[PDB]
Write a protein that binds this ligand. Structure first.
Ligand SMILES: Cc1ccc(NC(=O)c2ccnc(N3CCOCC3)c2)cc1NC(=O)c1ccc(NCC[C@@H]2CCCN2C)nc1
Length: 348
């Protein structure tokens, strides 16, 4: 057992192993708060997330367990992994806090797009890496669902990892109005049209890739409906096949009220872009999610010829998420989480 020390940081007491020094607050929300630190054991700059009252309700306890499971499984160069997980508790009886440790990220992709010269080469490399990461997570049936430039971290070498920095509770208020939390979302998620699949994240990749090519948000809607109109303007209104797959009858009935529009010419929206980038965008930004290119198919697209190596694009180990349908009490979620904390083995 390491020795732990205590310190107050803004609003709470952080109790962490001695290896972790120079803790400095970097973010806070209702689900957790994060400090940057130096891990003296590995020489790494690390982020330390202390979950906020992780076992306060069934919803919080299950979300704690879910995030811990996910981070324990994800072992890929383009996906955030878990460097450490700890608790000051010496037994299940006293277990109440959970701290998760990852590499400390620097710039995100907003910090890249808002103020650099992005060549086509940069765009190929950055999108290649997102798709490489997504082939991996999707091979485990892990769906991100909130892929957006602020969740992609990028180093000075343009190396990228997919994360989720979200520290707040999931919410309606959050996706309301002229907000980046909605601009990248697939329209079937945005309007709850149907059970969504892993290509919700490929739609987001199309939106991010468009934005690296033009420097502008592709669909900066002022609300859900305005955004839906921007979308349909570009990709055209749904045809009969897609309409049937809209299980929501009110939603299906709303889209039929709209004047039909044809899919636009993407070379005339993405003026000057590499024709192969334009081709790829046409395959990503398809309204019917059954017809969208997958991450694995996209990595094989000619746009990525300079980067694609089918022997160096790995898939994940099988990921059991049967717990998602398990009906458990707070203390059972808490014990499952405890076992995962104590069984953690650090990466090499
Ligand atoms: C410590 C920690 C603990 C857990 C997590 N969780 C996740 O990333 C996470 C949670 C749920 N799902 C995840 N998955 C979903 C499937 O696709 C892969 C990602 C990922 C993430 C962190 N890391 C951070 O939150 C973090 C915070 C700040 C930071 N650097 C500070 C500077 C910021 C970073 C980018 C822009 N900068 C201003 N680095 C890491």
């Amino acid at each position: 057992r390491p020795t732990f020390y205590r310190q107050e940081l803004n609003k709470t007491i952080w109790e962490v192993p001695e290896r972790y020094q120079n803790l400095s607050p970097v973010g806070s929300g209702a689900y957790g708060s994060v400090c940057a630190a130096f891990d003296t054991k590995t020489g790494l700059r690390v982020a330390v997330k202390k979950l906020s009252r992780p076992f306060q309700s069934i919803i919080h306890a299950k979300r704690t367990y879910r995030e811990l499971r996910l981070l324990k499984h994800m072992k890929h160069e383009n996906v955030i992994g878990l460097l450490d997980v700890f608790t000051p508790a010496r037994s299940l009886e006293e277990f109440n806090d959970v701290y998760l440790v990852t590499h400390l990220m620097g710039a995100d992709l907003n910090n890249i797009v808002k103020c650099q010269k992005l060549t086509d080469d940069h765009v190929q490399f950055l999108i290649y890496q997102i798709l490489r990461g997504l082939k991996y997570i999707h091979s485990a049936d892990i769906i991100h669902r909130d892929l957006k430039p602020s969740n992609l971290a990028v180093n000075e070498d343009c190396e990228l990892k997919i994360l989720d920095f979200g520290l707040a509770r999931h919410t309606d208020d959050e996706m309301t109005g002229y907000v980046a939390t909605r601009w990248y979302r697939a329209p079937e998620i945005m309007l709850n049209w149907m059970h969504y699949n892993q290509t919700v994240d490929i739609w987001s990749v199309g939106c991010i890739m468009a934005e690296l090519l033009t420097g502008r948000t592709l669909f900066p809607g002022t609300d859900h409906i305005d955004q839906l109109k921007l979308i349909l303007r570009l990709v055209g209104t749904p045809g009969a096949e897609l309409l049937k797959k809209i299980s929501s009858e009110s939603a299906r009935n709303y889209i039929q009220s709209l004047t039909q529009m044809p899919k636009m010419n993407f070379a005339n929206v993405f003026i000057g872009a590499n024709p192969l980038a334009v081709d790829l965008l046409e395959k990503m930004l398809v309204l019917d999610s059954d017809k969208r290119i997958t991450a694995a198919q996209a990595l094989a697209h000619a746009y990525f010829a300079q980067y694609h190596d089918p022997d160096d694009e790995p898939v994940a180990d099988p990921y059991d998420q049967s717990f998602e349908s398990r009906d458990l009490l707070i203390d059972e979620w808490k014990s499952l989480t405890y076992d995962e904390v104590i069984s953690f083995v650090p990466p090499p």
